Amino acid sequence: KETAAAKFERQHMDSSNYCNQMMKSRNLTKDRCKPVNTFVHESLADVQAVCSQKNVACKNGQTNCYQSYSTMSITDCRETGSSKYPNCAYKTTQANKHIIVACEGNPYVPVHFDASV
């Protein structure tokens, strides 16, 4: 099956409409309407480099989270009120914020998007 890192790229990388395209193309409206999702509009290498940046606590209490030194452009997709499966409707939203990701493996790469700050 896909690796967790591969899953992170599919669900979160991308180098109130835009979302509808993306939540679909990335297979996040497949079995459910995935309620919220952040896509990061920066380079793969940029986002991978965050694994060597500011070490911070993960929301689940694990210690393998990292926060980006620079702000990063990202899109938050949230699911509107009338949106129901399988016509998942999304509110595109745009920010420039630090991202936080959990990293694992050798090589040490992102495997979960934790938060943006």
Curated annotation (Swiss-Prot):
Main location group = secreted
Q: Which domain of life is it from?
A: Eukaryota
Q: Which residue positions are annotated as catalytic? A: 12 (proton acceptor), 112 (proton donor)
* Glycosylation site residues: 1, 7, 27, 30, 34
One MF term from GO for this chain? Answer: nucleic acid binding
Per UniProt, the enzyme's principal EC class comes to: lyase
List UniProt keywords, sorted A-Z: Disulfide bond, Endonuclease, Glycation, Glycoprotein, Hydrolase, Lyase, Nuclease, Secreted, Signal
Q: What family does this belong to?
A: Belongs to the pancreatic ribonuclease family.
Q: Know the name of this protein?
A: Ribonuclease pancreatic
Organism of provenance? Bos taurus (Bovine)
